[PDB]
PDB file of C-alpha atoms in Angstrom:
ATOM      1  CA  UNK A   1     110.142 106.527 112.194  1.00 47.50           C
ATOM      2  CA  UNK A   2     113.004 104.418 110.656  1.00 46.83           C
ATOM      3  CA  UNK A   3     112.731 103.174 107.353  1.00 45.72           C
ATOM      4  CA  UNK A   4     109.625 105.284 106.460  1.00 46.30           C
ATOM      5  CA  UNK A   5     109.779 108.192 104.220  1.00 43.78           C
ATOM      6  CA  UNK A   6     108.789 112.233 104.367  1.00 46.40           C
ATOM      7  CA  UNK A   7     105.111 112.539 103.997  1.00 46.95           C
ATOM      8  CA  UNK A   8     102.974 114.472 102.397  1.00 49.42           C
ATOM      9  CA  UNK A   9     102.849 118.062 103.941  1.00 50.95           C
ATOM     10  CA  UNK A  10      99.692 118.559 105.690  1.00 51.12           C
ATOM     11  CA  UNK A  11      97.879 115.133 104.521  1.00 53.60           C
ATOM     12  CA  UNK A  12      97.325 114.185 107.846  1.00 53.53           C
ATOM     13  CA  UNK A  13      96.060 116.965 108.924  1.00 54.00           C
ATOM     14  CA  UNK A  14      95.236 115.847 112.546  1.00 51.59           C
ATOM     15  CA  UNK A  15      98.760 115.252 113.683  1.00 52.74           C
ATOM     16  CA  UNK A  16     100.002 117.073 116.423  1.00 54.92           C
ATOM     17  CA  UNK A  17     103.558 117.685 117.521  1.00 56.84           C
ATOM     18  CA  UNK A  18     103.959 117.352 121.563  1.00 54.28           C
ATOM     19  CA  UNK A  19     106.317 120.213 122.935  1.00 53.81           C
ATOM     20  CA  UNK A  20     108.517 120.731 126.089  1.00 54.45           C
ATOM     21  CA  UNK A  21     109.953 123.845 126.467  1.00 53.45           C
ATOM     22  CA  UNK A  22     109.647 124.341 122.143  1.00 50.31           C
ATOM     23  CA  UNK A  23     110.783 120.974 121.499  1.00 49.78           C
ATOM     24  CA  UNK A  24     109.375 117.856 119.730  1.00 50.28           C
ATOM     25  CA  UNK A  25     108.644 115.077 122.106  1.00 50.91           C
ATOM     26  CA  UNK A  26     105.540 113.262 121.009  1.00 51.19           C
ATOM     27  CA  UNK A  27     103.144 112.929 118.118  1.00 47.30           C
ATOM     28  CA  UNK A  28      99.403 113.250 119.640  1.00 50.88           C
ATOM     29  CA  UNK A  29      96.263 113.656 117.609  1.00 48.87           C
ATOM     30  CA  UNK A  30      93.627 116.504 117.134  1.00 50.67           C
ATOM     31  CA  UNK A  31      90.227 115.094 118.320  1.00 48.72           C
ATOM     32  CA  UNK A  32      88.516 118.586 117.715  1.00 47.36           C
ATOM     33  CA  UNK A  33      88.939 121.975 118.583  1.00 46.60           C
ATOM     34  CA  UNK A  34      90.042 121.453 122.313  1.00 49.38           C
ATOM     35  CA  UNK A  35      91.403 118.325 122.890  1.00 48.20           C
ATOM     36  CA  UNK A  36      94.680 116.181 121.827  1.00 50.54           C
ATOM     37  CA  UNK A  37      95.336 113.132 122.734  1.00 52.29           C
ATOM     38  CA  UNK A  38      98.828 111.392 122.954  1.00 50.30           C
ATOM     39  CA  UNK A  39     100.999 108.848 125.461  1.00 48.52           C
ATOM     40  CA  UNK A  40     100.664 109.531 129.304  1.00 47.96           C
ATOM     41  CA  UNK A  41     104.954 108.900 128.830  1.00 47.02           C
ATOM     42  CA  UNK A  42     105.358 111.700 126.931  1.00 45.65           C
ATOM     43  CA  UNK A  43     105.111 113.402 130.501  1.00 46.95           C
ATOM     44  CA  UNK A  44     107.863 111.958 132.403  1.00 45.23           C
ATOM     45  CA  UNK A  45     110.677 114.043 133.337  1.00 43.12           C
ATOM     46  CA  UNK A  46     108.412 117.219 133.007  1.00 43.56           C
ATOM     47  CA  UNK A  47     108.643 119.629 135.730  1.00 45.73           C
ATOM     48  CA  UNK A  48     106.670 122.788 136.692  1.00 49.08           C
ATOM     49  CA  UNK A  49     109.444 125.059 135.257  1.00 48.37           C
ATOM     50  CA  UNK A  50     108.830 123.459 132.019  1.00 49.79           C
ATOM     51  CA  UNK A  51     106.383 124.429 129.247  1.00 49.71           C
ATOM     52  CA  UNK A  52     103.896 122.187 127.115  1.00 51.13           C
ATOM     53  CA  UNK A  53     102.662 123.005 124.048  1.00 50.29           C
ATOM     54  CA  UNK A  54     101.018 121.462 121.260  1.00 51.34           C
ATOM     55  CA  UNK A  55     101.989 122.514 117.702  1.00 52.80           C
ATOM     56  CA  UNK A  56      99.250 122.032 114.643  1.00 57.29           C
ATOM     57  CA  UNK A  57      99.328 122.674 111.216  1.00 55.58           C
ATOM     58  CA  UNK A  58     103.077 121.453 111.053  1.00 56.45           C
ATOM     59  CA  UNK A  59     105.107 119.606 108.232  1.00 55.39           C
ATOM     60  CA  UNK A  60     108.015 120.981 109.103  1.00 56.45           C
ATOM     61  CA  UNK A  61     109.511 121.772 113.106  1.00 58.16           C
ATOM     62  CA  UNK A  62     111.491 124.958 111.481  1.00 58.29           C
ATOM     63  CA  UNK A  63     109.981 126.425 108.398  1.00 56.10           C
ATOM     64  CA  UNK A  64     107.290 128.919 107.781  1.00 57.34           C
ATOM     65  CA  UNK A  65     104.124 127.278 107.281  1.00 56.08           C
ATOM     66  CA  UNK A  66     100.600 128.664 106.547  1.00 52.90           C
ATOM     67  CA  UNK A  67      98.675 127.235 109.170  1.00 51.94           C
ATOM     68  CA  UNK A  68     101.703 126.094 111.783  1.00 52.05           C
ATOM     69  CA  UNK A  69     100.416 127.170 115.585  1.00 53.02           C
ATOM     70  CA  UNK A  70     101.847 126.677 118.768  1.00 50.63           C
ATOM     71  CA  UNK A  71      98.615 126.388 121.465  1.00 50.64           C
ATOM     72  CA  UNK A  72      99.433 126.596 125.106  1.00 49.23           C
ATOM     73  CA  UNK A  73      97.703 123.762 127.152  1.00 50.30           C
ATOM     74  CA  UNK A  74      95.345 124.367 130.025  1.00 49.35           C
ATOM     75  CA  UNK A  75      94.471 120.803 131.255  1.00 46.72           C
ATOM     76  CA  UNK A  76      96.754 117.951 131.466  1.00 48.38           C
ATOM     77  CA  UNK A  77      94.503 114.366 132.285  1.00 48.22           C
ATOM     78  CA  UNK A  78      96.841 111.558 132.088  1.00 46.66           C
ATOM     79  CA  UNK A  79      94.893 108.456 132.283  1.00 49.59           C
ATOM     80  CA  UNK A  80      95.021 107.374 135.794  1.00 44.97           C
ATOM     81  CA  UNK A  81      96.215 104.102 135.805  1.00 46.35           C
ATOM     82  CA  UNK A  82      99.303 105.066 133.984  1.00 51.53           C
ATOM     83  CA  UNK A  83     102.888 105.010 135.659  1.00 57.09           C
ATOM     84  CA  UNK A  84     106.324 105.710 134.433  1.00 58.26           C
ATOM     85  CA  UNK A  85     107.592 102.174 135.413  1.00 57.44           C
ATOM     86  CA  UNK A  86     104.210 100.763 133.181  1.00 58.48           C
ATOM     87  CA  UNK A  87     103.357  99.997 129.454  1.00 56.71           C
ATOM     88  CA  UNK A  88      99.676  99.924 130.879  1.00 56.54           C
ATOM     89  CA  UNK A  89      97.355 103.164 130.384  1.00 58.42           C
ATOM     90  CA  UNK A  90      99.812 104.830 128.047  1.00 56.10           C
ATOM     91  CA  UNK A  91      97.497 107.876 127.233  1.00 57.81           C
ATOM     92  CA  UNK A  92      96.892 111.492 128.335  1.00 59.21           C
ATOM     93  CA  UNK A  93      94.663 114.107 127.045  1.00 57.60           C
ATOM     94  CA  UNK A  94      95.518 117.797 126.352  1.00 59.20           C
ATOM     95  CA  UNK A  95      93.063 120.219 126.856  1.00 60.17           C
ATOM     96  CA  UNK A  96      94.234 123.541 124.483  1.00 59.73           C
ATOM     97  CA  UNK A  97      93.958 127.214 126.224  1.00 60.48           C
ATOM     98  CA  UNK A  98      92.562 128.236 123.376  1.00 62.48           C
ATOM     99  CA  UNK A  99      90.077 126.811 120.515  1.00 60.80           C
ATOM    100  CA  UNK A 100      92.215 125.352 117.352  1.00 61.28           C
ATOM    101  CA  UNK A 101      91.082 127.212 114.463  1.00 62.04           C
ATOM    102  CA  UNK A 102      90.257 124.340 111.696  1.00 62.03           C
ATOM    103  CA  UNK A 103      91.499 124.592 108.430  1.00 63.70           C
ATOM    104  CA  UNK A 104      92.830 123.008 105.072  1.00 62.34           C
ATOM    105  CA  UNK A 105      95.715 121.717 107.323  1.00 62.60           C
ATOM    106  CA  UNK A 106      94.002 121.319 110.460  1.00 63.94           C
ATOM    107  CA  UNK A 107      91.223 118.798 111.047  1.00 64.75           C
ATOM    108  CA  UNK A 108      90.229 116.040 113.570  1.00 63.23           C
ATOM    109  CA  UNK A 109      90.406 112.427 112.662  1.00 64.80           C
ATOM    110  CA  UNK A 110      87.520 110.308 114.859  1.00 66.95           C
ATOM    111  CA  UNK A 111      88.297 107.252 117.219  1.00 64.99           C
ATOM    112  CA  UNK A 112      87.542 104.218 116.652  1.00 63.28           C
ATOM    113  CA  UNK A 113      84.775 103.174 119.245  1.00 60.70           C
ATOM    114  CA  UNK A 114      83.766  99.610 118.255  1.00 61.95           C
ATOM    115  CA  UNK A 115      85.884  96.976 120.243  1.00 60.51           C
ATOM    116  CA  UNK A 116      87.159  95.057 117.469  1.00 58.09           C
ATOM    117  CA  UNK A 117      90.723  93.732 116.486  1.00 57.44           C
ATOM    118  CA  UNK A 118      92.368  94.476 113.634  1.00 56.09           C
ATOM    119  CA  UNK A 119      92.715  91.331 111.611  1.00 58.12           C
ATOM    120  CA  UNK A 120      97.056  90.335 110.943  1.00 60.46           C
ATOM    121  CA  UNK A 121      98.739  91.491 108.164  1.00 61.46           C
ATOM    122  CA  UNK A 122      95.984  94.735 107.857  1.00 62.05           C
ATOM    123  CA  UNK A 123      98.641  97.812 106.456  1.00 62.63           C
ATOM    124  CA  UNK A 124      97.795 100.687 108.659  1.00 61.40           C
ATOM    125  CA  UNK A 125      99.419 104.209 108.889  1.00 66.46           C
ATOM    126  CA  UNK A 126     101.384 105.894 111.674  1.00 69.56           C
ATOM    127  CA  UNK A 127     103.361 109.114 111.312  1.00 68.95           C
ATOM    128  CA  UNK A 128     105.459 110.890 113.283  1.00 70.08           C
ATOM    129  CA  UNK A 129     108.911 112.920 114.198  1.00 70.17           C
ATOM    130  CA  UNK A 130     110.608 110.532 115.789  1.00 67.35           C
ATOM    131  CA  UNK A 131     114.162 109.403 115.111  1.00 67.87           C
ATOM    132  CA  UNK A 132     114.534 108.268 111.479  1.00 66.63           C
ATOM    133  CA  UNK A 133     118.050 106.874 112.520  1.00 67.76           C
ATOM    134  CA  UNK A 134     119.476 104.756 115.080  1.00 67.51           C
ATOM    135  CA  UNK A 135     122.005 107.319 115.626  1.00 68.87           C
ATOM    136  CA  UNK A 136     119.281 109.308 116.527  1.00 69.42           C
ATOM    137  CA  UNK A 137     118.883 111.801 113.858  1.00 66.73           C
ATOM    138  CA  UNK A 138     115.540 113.962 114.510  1.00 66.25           C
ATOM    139  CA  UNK A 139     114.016 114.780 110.949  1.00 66.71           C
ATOM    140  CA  UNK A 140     113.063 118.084 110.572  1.00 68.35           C
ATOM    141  CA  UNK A 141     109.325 116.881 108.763  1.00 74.20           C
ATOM    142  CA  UNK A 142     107.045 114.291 109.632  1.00 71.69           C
ATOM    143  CA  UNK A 143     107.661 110.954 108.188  1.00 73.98           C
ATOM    144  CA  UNK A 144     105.367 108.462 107.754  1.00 71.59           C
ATOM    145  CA  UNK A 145     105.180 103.896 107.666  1.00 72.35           C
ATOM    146  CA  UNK A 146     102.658 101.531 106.703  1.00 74.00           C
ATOM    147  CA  UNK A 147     102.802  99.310 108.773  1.00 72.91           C
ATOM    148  CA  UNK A 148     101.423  95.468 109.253  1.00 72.75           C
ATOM    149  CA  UNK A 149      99.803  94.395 112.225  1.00 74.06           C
ATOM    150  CA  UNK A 150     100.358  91.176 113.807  1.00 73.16           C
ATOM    151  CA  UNK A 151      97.541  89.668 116.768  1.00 74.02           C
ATOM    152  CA  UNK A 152      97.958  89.861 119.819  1.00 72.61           C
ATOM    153  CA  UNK A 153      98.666  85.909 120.385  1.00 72.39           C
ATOM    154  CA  UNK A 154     101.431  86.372 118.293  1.00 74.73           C
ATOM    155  CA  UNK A 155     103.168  89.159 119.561  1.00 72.84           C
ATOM    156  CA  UNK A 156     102.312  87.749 123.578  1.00 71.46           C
ATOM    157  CA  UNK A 157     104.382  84.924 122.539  1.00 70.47           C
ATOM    158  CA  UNK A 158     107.717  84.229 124.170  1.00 70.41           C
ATOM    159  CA  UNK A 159     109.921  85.223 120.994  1.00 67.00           C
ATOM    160  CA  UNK A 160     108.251  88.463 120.950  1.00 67.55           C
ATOM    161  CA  UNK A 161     106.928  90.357 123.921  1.00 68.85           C
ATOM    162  CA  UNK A 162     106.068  87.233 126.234  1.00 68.01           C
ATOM    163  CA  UNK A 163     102.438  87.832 127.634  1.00 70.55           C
ATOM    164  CA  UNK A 164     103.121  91.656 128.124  1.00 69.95           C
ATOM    165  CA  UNK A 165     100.393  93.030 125.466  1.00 69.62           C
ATOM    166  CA  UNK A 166      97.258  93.345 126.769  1.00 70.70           C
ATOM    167  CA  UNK A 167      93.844  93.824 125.620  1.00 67.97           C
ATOM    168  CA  UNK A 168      93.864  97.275 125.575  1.00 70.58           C
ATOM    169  CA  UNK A 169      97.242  97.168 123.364  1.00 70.18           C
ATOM    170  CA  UNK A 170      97.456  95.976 119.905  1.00 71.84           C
ATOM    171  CA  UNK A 171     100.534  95.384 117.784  1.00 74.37           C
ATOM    172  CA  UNK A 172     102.575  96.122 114.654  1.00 74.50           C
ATOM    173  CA  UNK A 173     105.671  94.287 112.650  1.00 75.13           C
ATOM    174  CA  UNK A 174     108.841  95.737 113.245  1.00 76.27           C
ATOM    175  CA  UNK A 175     111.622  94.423 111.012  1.00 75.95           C
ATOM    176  CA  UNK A 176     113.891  97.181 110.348  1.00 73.48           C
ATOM    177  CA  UNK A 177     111.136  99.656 109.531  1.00 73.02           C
ATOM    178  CA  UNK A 178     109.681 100.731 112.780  1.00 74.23           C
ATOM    179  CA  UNK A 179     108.663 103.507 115.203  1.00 69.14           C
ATOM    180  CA  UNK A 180     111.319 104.941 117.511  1.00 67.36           C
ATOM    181  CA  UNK A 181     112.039 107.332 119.964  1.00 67.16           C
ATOM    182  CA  UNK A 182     109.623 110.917 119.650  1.00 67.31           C
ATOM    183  CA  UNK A 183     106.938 108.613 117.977  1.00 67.98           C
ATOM    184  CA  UNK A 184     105.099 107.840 120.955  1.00 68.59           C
ATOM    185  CA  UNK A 185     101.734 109.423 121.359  1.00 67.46           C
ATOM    186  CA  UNK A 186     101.340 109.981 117.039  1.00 68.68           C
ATOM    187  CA  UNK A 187      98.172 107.641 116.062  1.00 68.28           C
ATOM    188  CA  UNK A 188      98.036 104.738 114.166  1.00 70.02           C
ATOM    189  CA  UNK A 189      95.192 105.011 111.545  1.00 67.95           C
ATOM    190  CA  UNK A 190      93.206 101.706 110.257  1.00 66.74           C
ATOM    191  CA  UNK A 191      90.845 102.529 108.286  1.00 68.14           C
ATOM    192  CA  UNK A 192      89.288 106.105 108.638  1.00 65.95           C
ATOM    193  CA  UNK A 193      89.981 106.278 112.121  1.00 66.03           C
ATOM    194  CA  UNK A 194      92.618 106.005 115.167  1.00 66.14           C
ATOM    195  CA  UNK A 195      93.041 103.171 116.036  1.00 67.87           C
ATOM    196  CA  UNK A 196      96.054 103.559 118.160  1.00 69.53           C
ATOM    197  CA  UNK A 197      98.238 105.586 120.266  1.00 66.42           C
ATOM    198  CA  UNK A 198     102.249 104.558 119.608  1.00 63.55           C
ATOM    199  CA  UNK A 199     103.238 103.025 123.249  1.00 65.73           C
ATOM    200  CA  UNK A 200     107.033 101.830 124.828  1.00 66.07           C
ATOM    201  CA  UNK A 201     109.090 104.560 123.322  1.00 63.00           C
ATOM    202  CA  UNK A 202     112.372 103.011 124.969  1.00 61.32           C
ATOM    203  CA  UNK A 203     111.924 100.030 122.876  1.00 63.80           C
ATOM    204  CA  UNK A 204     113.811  99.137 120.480  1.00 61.93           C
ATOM    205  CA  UNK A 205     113.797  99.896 117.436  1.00 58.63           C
ATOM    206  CA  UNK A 206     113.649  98.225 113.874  1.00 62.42           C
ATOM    207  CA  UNK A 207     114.176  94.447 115.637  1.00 59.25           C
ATOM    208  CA  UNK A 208     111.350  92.202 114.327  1.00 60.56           C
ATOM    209  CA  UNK A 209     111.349  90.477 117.176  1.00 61.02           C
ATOM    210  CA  UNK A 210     110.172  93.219 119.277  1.00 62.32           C
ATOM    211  CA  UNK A 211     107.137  94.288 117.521  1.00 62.74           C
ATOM    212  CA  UNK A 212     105.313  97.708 117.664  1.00 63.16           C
ATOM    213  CA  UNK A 213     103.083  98.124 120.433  1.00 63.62           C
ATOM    214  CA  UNK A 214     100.217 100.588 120.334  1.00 64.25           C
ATOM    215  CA  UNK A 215      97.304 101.666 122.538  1.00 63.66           C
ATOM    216  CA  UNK A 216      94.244 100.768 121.478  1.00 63.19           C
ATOM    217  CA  UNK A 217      91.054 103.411 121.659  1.00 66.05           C
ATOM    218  CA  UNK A 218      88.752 101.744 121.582  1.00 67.86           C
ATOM    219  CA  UNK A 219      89.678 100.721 124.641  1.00 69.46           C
ATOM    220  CA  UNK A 220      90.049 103.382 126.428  1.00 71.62           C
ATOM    221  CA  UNK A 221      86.287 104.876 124.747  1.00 71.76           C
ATOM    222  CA  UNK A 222      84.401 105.513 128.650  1.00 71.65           C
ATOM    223  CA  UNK A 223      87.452 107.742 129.886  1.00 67.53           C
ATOM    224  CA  UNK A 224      87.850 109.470 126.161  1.00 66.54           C
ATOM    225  CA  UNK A 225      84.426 110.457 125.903  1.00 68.49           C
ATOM    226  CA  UNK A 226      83.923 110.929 130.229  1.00 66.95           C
ATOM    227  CA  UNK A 227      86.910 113.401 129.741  1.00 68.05           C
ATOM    228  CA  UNK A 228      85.774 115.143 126.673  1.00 68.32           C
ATOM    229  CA  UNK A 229      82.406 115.698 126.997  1.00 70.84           C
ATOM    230  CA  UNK A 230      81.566 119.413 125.752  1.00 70.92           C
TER     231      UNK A 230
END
């Protein structure tokens, strides 16, 4: 996140950290005690001699935390219509080996189900431990951005993303203060509930004219719930 600030520790208690080989690459979010969702990108490059895992509990990457655990993943379900050449389909669920215990710093957030847009200018939250420079410095705690959301006939025009955003996808404003790279897959929260999954995480960063782009859930409900299902 650029232009955001350190959040609270352990306020958002369903973010996840996305590892490869014990390494940040993604936010994701808890959905309950088995499953994580995140960005079907946050795959790409990985190869069987890697490792995934998802860390929970975490404020900080490096510090000794109360609740911090690293859970080994068991099913990997991107969502099939999504492709590393793509923006479309961005999202992948995580099945955990093992069932996350729950705790003060360790909770699901729900999905938002009902198919409705979130109206411009609407502050939501996203938070993640992505780059909080351009240089590229990787913070060591999660950071966090209200952020406004624009429509989608706004951002589809041609001095923003030019009819790429689809109905599944959803927007955000993105002067200066912005996601960036290792904040794809963290959710962004409207309301009491995930709205959306942080998308394009080669975009550019912190250039208003290329607005945040986000999965939306809602969209996506049939395949969460088909996938899910205890």
């Amino acid at each position: 996140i650029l232009g955001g600030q350190e959040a609270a520790a352990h306020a958002r208690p369903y973010m996840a950290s996305v590892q490869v080989n014990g390494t940040h690459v993604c936010g994701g979010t808890l959905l309950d005690e088995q499953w994580v969702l995140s960005a079907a990108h946050c795959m790409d490059g990985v190869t069987d001699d890697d490792s995934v895992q998802v860390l929970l509990g975490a404020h900080s990457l490096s510090a000794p935390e109360p609740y911090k655990r690293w859970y080994d993943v068991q099913s990997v379900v991107p969502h099939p219509g999504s492709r590393p050449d793509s923006l479309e389909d961005d999202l992948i669920l995580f099945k955990l080996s093992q069932n996350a215990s729950l705790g003060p710093h360790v909770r699901p957030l729900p999905l938002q189900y009902e198919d409705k847009e979130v109206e411009p200018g609407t502050l939501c939250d996203v938070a993640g431990w992505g780059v909080v420079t351009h240089a590229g410095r990787r913070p060591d705690v999660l950071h966090q951005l209200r952020v406004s959301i624009m429509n989608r006939t706004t951002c589809n025009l041609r001095t923003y993303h030019d009819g790429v955003v689809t109905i599944n996808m959803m927007c955000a404003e993105s002067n200066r203060r912005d996601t960036c790279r290792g904040d794809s897959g963290s959710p962004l929260v409207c309301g009491d509930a995930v709205e959306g999954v942080v998308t394009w995480g080669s975009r550019v960063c912190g250039n208003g004219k290329k607005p945040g782009v986000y999965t939306r859930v809602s969209s996506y409900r049939m395949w969460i719930e088909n996938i899910t299902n205890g």
